[PDB]
């Protein structure tokens, strides 16, 4: 059967495979076939790129990326099947069944049997093509599935003027590998390489961002009448050489995130280009080197908060990265009166820096204590005859901390034992935090507190 | 304007009523007799017993072939006298006869292995009791077949009961209640004796036996009369599921049927053959049609000593008549088809079967194909299971990872850079001989054979995602694994 | 060659339908007759077939990655070897990574 080939750049292997696999006559097509791949390769791009190559063949399209389960596939299928039928056989009569009537593949099979026994009177036989993009990528997926969709040519009667065919697309290969015992045809796409993804992008996104506005903006923000679109593509080109010569190391052989970061950081580079910058794009690249050096792609201050929320959190990082015993040396200020010894502190250095560690547990009283101990000074005295006699110039267990603490579990910057039927109130409960160092660091120099010395010495 | 939050349209609601019979007379004096009734006591199922007879009928006939053995097969099939199991007959028929003489509410439980003639013997006991109904001297009463396994939802017992005692249609939660109303609230003089028998209760009442609890709760009246039975395999069930007070207070009678003796077995299977035993046939010359008292007149026979050994081997294990009878039929089959293969007729003066082929039929049941298969595989699976046993030899672990076994494999190979068989299967497994092909950490076909054995059932893979640390287990034995191992000329020496 | 692949099924898999699957594309691409002749003679395109067949399972996938991935994977590997269960985390690998670089630049 005469099949126009898509004269593609980079997949003329799989082109050969599938244009050989498939033609109008179903007999020279297999019963069930997979086209596995990986993202960005345009597997889904190239399937329709082949349907461009062959119009008289038609297919249905589903995208269960959005569906969740099995029954919704059944419903969408039962819709699109007879939809497509009657849309493409207009003259034919029907008794269009409800697609929502399906709730189980048997019911799908039954209603398709009805579709066919009403479509009995055709002139020649026809096989059509079903498409399930991301049938691995489902969201309550279990392993009792793909065999069933193989078995759809199983239960169909052989006297069908109208038959169908299945098409798939996966990623991992692990759950593929789980099931290849059925001796299946399959076609595949290796993750590209650097000249390959390069040329895919110089042929794909070239016209897009050659025909985005910011060109037409900048050309006349600068107001310079020495231009041609050869050089437009050329400067875009060498700009993308710079892009990829930077961040190939960052990613390798992908396109999507490159497109994202292009869209974001393109315009700043537009903002820098000029006449000298086009006559010598090296210094231009120097003049826009910086995002190549620093992606920085997110967005002085960090919080508009209260003070105890700022200062209490600072303590728990300590009370799960410090030994409870190795603190009484540094976290004391009282002048001894009655006889008794301190300890020696850490005789031995530790060599692993529990910054790298999954931290520990603690009860709260440890925080009640340590927070009082660290607390910024309040209750200003005078050295008067009665000023400091009754002031008791040291913060105590108010209510505000309890409630500004309860706020935090819901802000989920403390964690506890993750629990349904949580009870904050128990004797047994262990607590913790879920934060890194950098969180606790960004508090400090803003509030002008210091604890980096308590950690900077041990390893 | 409104929208239903979720739809059910493929429902098939059943037209069955919620009003029990208790609310269509409205007084004790207001009730007619069920015996003086056309619709009660089932005078209408016969039409639906005959309505469907014609659906499958034909008269196609072209060159019928008919041979010697098949008539004896169907002499020997289970779908038909027996004196072997007759004291239970003389005891339970006595009990049921005295029971319907007593007009009491008696109860009985029996069990027995599948293949004890339990259903047979009982169905024949009650056929004799049918002829006793044809005495017209005992009070007429009515049977109830209960095949919960030929029922879906085990509360449908009540439903079908009402739709066969009345032909009236409801749900269980009306039917059983109307039925209690039918049972205790109703006097004797017009209510009928009914006999019922339950089959294989081991799966019927699986949740909490509230159904069968209801049943046995119905079986404890003095104004209501019934004849109840059941079948199982286990015996503790009446006290197991209930407990002791209930099963004790009821005070029923318990029994089970056992495996038969080899002599009774042969006696009976021949008792289903005496019409054809040692018989002589007129026999045509082309089709070989065996026609009975261009034609011969020959004799037919079968190995009697083979009857002896065949019954003798399987009388000792279970006593399953069905097994004996299939062994007989399959022996006949191999005899007949070898005979046909002698002459080669196509498709459009003695004949006897042997102890040799009787046992040939009886034995392959126990002769497993797995061994010849696992011997007749490729080299790789054998190699790998051998490595597994090597590990089991190295540690005595009873279990292995994937990484550890694959390490064992590579070691078991690279040790033997000297054996020839491994010398010659050397390069054609990773990159297959030629260049242009980079190496791969694992071999080809290892995932294939892995899954192959998983499907086979020998291999057991727990649920994890890692390829390396997933624990693995073998299912069968190591000895038999060696009975595959050394059978390879190259493996026995390494 | 084709007898040797017959051997391959006889030893690798011992089952036919996979073989038929492999056999199909041979004709399926076959366009003229001299091509059929020379191609089934050499079976050089079985090479392309079976190179692109299980190409992207374990090896070529690691063949195409950055060196950063390699450095960190090493930082995970050697410390898992140092470990009992081989467990590892993010900053641990980051630490051993930078140690590797310090050694390299030292
Ligand atoms: N052979 C090719 N020729 C030209 N462009 C290509 C080719 N392969 C990929 N592309 C480009 O890469 C993009 C990838 O699109 P697509 O989402 O189809 O990739 P994918 O691998 O199918 O992703 P998914 O994992 O979502 O299926 C295409 O839209 C196309 O612009
Ligand atoms: N004494 C006998 N006389 C004639 N046939 C017998 C005798 N004993 C066993 N059989 C044969 O063996 C079969 C035994 O049937 P049996 O009544 O044991 O079924 P069952 O045990 O109720 O089955 P299940 O346990 O599956 O309900 C019968 O079908 C019958 O052909
Ligand atoms: Mg896609
Ligand atoms: Mg039975």
Buried b (16+ CB within 10 A) or exposed e, A165-203: bbbbbbeebeebeeebbeebbebbbbbbeeebbbebbee
Q: Which of C24, C26, C55 to mutate to test the interface with A (most CBs of A within 10 A)?
A: C24
DSSP state of A145: -
DSSP state of A98: P
Euclidean distance between CA atoms B165 and B185, whole angstroms: 17
The residue with tokens 């009678």 is B253
Element (H, E) at B198: strand B195-198
Q: How many CB pairs under 8 A join A and B?
A: 19
Q: Tell me if residue A35 falls in helix, strand or coil.
A: strand
Q: How far is the CA of B233 from the centre of ligand 4 (A)?
A: 10
Euclidean distance between CA atoms A173 and A249, whole angstroms: 25
Q: Tell me if residue B196 falls in helix, strand or coil.
A: strand
Euclidean distance between CA atoms B20 and B176, whole angstroms: 9
Q: Tell me if residue B195 falls in helix, strand or coil.
A: strand
Euclidean distance between CA atoms A233 and B115, whole angstroms: 87
Q: How far lies B139's CA from each of A47, B34, B92, B98, B124, in Å?
A: 80, 16, 18, 12, 20
Q: Is B344 annotated as ligand-binding? A: yes
Euclidean distance between CA atoms A364 and A367, whole angstroms: 5
DSSP state of B55: G
Q: How far lies A17's CA from each of A132, B189, C22, C34, C41, in Å?
A: 20, 85, 11, 20, 20
Strands (E), B379-465: 459-461
| Beta-carbon separation of A181 and B455 below 8 A | yes
**Strand partners for A128:** A164
How many CA atoms does the CB half-sphere of A243 hold within 13 Å?
25
The residue with tokens 């200003």 is A380
Those residues with Cβ within 8 angstroms of residue B253's Cβ, 6 or more apart along the chain or in another chain:
B95, B107, B108, B109
Buried b (16+ CB within 10 A) or exposed e, A33-54: bbbbbbebbbbbebbeebeebb
For residue B106 the two structure tokens come to: 């008696």
CA distance A110 to chain B (A): 12
How many CA atoms does the CB half-sphere of B77 hold within 13 Å?
7
Element (H, E) at B77: none
On whether the CB atoms of residues B109 and B255 are closer than 8 A, the answer is yes
For residue B455 the two structure tokens come to: 């499907």
Closest CA to B232 of B200, B277, B205: B200
Element (H, E) at B10: none
**Cα C83 to chain centroid, rounded:** 29
Q: What are phi and psi of A73, to 5 degrees?
A: -60, -45
**Strand partners for B299:** B280, B350
For residue A167 the two structure tokens come to: 């098409």
On whether the CB atoms of residues A200 and A192 are closer than 8 A, the answer is yes
Euclidean distance between CA atoms A195 and A398, whole angstroms: 66
Euclidean distance between CA atoms A1 and A29, whole angstroms: 11
Element (H, E) at A36: none
**Atom number, ligand 1, closest to the C-alpha of residue A38:** 21
CA dihedral sign of residues A376, A377, A379, A380? negative
Q: How far lies B100's CA from each of B87, B122, B124, B141, B250, in Å?
A: 20, 17, 18, 9, 19
Q: How far is the CA of A172 from the centre of ligand 3 (A)?
A: 15
DSSP state of B280: E
For residue B408 the two structure tokens come to: 């064992």
Q: Tell me if residue B107 falls in helix, strand or coil.
A: strand
Euclidean distance between CA atoms A80 and C34, whole angstroms: 45
Q: Does A177 touch chain B (CB under 8 A)?
A: yes
| Ligand 2, atom 21: closest residue by C-alpha | B114
Percentages of chain B per state (helix, strand, coil), in multiples of 5: 45, 10, 45
Closest CA to B422 of B373, B481, B489: B489
**Cα B147 to chain centroid, rounded:** 14
Q: Tell me if residue B429 falls in helix, strand or coil.
A: coil
For residue A83 the two structure tokens come to: 């939809």
Euclidean distance between CA atoms B388 and B382, whole angstroms: 10
A249-A254-A255-A256 Cα dihedral, nearest 10 degrees:
-100
CA distance C12 to chain B (A): 6
Q: Tell me if residue B360 falls in helix, strand or coil.
A: helix
On whether the CB atoms of residues B281 and B334 are closer than 8 A, the answer is no
Q: How far is the CA of B366 from the centre of ligand 2 (A)?
A: 22
Q: How far lies A248's CA from each of A9, A195, A255, C66, in Å?
A: 21, 11, 10, 7
* String of DSSP letters for B139-160: ---B--EE-GGGSSSTTHHHHH
Q: Which long-range contacts (CB under 8 A, 24 or more apart) does B396-401 make?
A: B398/B473, B399/B471, B399/B472, B399/B473, B400/B471, B400/B472, B400/B473, B401/B468, B401/B469, B401/B470, B401/B471, B401/B472
Ligand 2 in contact with B120 (CB < 6 A)? Answer: yes
On whether the CB atoms of residues B200 and B113 are closer than 8 A, the answer is no
Q: Which of B421, B428, B429, B468 to mutate to test the interface with C (most CBs of C within 10 A)?
A: B428
Task: Report strand pairing: A414-416 vs A431-433.
Answer: antiparallel
**Strand partners for B459:** B474
Euclidean distance between CA atoms A203 and B135, whole angstroms: 99
The residue with tokens 């290892």 is B446
Buried b (16+ CB within 10 A) or exposed e, C13-48: bbeeebbebbebbbebbeeeeeeeeebeeeeebbbe
* String of DSSP letters for B199-257: --TTTTTTTT-HHHHHHHHHT--SSS-EEEEEEES-SSHHHHHS-HHHHHHHT-EEEEE
Annotated binding site of A for ATP: 37-44
Region of A297 please: left (phi>0), alpha (psi -120 to 50) or beta: beta
Number of residues assigned to chain B: 494
Euclidean distance between CA atoms B210 and B172, whole angstroms: 13
Euclidean distance between CA atoms B446 and B459, whole angstroms: 13
Euclidean distance between CA atoms A115 and A126, whole angstroms: 14
Ligand 1 in contact with A37 (CB < 6 A)? Answer: yes
Q: How many CB pairs under 8 A join B and C?
A: 38
Euclidean distance between CA atoms A162 and A127, whole angstroms: 6
Closest CA to C58 of B440, A35, A253: B440
Those residues with Cβ within 8 angstroms of residue A435's Cβ, 6 or more apart along the chain or in another chain:
A313, A317, A413
B488-B494-C6-C12 Cα dihedral, nearest 10 degrees:
110
Q: How far is the CA of B105 from the centre of ligand 2 (A)?
A: 28
Euclidean distance between CA atoms B472 and B464, whole angstroms: 11
Closest CA to A204 of A133, A256, A266: A256
* String of DSSP letters for A338-393: SS-------SS--SS-GGGS------THHHHHHHHHHPPP-S-----SSHHHH---
Q: How far lies A336's CA from each of A393, A418, C89, in Å?
A: 20, 42, 44
DSSP state of B282: E
Q: Which of B7, B451, B467 sits opposite A100 (nearest CB)?
A: B7
Task: Record the resolution, in angstroms.
Answer: 4.4
Euclidean distance between CA atoms A282 and A238, whole angstroms: 10
Angle at which helices A437-447 and A307-316 cross, to 10°: 140
* Chain A (320-359) residues lying within 8 Å, Cβ to Cβ, of chain B: none
On whether the CB atoms of residues B41 and B165 are closer than 8 A, the answer is yes
- What topology is assigned to A12-188 in CATH? Rossmann fold (3.40.50)
Cβ neighbours of B378 in C, within 8 Å: 10-14
Ligand 1 in contact with A64 (CB < 6 A)? Answer: no
Q: Which of A181, A184, A186, A190 to mutate to test the interface with B (most CBs of B within 10 A)?
A: A181
């Amino acid at each position: 059967m005469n099949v126009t080939t898509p004269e593609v750049a980079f997949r003329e292997y799989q082109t050969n495979c599938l244009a050989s696999y498939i033609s109008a006559d179903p007999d020279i097509t297999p019963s069930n076939l997979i086209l596995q791949g990986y993202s960005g390769t345009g597997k889904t791009y190239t399937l329709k790129k082949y349907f461009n190559a062959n119009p008289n063949l038609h297919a249905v399209w589903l995208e269960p990326v959005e569906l969740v389960s099995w029954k919704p596939l059944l419903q969408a299928i039962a819709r699109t099947v007879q939809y497509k039928l009657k849309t493409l056989y207009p003259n034919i009569p029907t008794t269009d069944y409800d697609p929502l009537q399906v709730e189980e593949p048997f019911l799908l099979v039954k209603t398709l049997h009805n579709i066919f026994v009403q479509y009995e009177s055709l002139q020649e036989k026809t096989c059509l093509f079903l498409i399930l993009d991301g049938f691995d990528s489902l969201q309550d997926l279990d392993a009792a599935l793909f065999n069933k969709y193989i078995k759809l040519n199983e239960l169909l009667p052989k006297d069908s003027k109208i038959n169908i065919k299945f098409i798939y697309t996966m990623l991992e290969t692990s759950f593929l590998q789980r099931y290849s015992t059925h001796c299946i045809p399959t076609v595949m796409f290796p993750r590209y390489n650097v000249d390959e993804v390069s040329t895919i992008l110089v042929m794909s996104r070239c016209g897009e961002l050659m025909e985005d506005s910011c060109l037409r903006k900048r050309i006349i923000e600068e107001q310079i009448t020495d231009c041609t679109d050869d050089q437009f593509q050329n400067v875009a080109a060498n700009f993308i050489h710079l892009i990829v010569q930077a961040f190939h190391s960052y990613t390798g052989n992908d396109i999507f995130a490159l497109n994202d970061l292009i869209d974001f950081k393109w315009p700043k580079y537009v903002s820098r280009i000029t006449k000298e910058n086009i006559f010598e794009p090296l210094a231009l690249y120097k003049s826009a080197i910086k995002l190549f050096l620093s992606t920085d792609d997110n967005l002085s201050q960090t919080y508009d908060l209260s003070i105890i929320s700022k200062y209490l959190l600072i303590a728990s990082y300590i009370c799960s990265y410090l030994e409870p015993r190795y603190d009484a040396s540094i976290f004391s200020r009282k002048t001894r009166i009655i006889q008794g010894r301190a300890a020696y502190g850490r005789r031995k250095k530790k060599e692993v820096n529990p910054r790298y560690l999954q931290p520990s547990l603690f009860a709260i009283e440890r925080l009640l204590a340590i927070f009082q101990a660290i607390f910024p000074i309040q209750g200003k005295a005078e050295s008067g005859s009665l000023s400091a006699l009754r002031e008791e110039s040291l913060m105590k267990a108010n209510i505000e901390v309890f409630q500004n603490l309860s706020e935090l579990h819901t802000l989920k910057l403390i964690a506890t034992t993750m629990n349904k039927n949580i009870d904050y109130l128990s004797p047994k409960v262990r607590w913790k935090v879920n934060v890194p160092w950098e969180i606790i660091k960004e508090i400090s120099e803003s509030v002008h507190f210091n604890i980096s010395d308590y950690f900077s010495d041990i390893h | 304007p409104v929208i239903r939050k979720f739809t059910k349209k493929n429902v098939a609601r059943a037209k069955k009523k919620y009003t029990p019979f208790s609310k269509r007379f409205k007084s004790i004096a207001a009730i007619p007799d069920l015996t003086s009734l056309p619709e009660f006591y089932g005078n209408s199922s016969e039409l639906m017993a005959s309505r469907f007879e014609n659906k499958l009928k034909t008269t196609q006939k072209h060159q019928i072939v008919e041979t010697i053995f098949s008539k004896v097969k169907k002499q020997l099939n289970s779908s038909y006298y027996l004196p072997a199991r007759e004291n239970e007959f003389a005891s339970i028929y006595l009990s049921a006869y005295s029971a319907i003489e007593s007009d009491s509410a008696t109860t009985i439980y029996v069990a027995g292995t599948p293949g004890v003639g339990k259903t047979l013997t009982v169905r024949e006991v009650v056929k004799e009791l049918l002829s006793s109904s044809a005495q017209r001297e005992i009070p007429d009463f009515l049977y109830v077949e209960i095949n919960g396994l030929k029922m879906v939802k085990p509360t449908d017992c009540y439903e079908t009961l009402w739709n066969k005692v009345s032909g009236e249609r409801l749900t269980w939660a009306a039917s059983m209640e109307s039925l209690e109303f039918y049972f205790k609230r109703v006097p004797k003089n017009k209510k009928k004796t009914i006999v019922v028998l339950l089959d294989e209760l081991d799966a019927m009442v699986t949740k909490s036996q509230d159904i069968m609890y209801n049943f046995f709760n119905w079986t404890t009246y003095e104004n209501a009369k019934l004849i109840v039975i059941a079948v199982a395999n286990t015996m503790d069930l009446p006290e197991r599921q209930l407990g002791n007070k209930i099963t004790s207070r009821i005070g029923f009678t318990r029994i089970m049927f056992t495996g038969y003796t080899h002599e009774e077995l042969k006696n009976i299977i021949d008792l289903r053959l005496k019409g054809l035993n040692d018989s002589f046939f007129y026999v045509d010359t082309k089709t070989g049609n065996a026609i009975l008292i261009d034609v011969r007149k020959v004799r037919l026979r079968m190995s009697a000593d083979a009857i002896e050994i065949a019954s003798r081997k399987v009388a000792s294990v279970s006593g399953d008549a069905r097994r004996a009878l299939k062994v007989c039929k399959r022996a006949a089959e191999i005899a007949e088809k070898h005979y046909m293969a002698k002459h080669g007729y196509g498709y459009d003066g003695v004949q006897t079967v042997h102890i040799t082929h009787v046992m040939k039929a009886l034995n392959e049941t126990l002769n497993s194909h797995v061994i010849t298969f696992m011997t007749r595989l490729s080299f790789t699976a054998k190699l790998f299971i051998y490595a597994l046993l090597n590990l089991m030899k190295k540690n005595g672990s009873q279990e292995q990872e994937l990484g550890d076994i694959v390490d064992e494999i590579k070691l078991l190979i690279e040790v033997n850079g000297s054996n020839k068989f491994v010398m010659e299967i050397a390069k054609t497994l990773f990159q297959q001989g030629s260049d242009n092909i980079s190496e791969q950490l694992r071999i080809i076909s290892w995932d294939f054979v892995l899954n192959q054995l998983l499907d086979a059932g020998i291999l057991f893979k727990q649920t994890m995602k890692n390829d390396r640390i997933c624990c693995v287990k073998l299912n069968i034995s190591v000895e038999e694994a060696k009975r595959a191992m050394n059978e390879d000329e190259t493996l026995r020496n390494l | 060659n084709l007898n040797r692949h017959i051997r391959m099924n006889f030893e690798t898999f011992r089952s036919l339908p996979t073989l038929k699957n492999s056999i199909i594309p041979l004709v399926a691409t076959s366009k003229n007759f001299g091509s059929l002749c020379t191609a089934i003679k050499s079976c050089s395109f079985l090479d392309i077939y079976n190179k692109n067949q299980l190409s992207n399972n374990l090896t070529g996938r690691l063949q195409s990655l950055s060196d950063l991935e390699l450095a960190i994977l090493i930082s995970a590997a050697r410390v898992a070897l140092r470990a009992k269960d081989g467990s590892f985390n993010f900053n641990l690998a980051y630490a051993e990574y930078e140690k590797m670089i310090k050694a390299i630049n030292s």
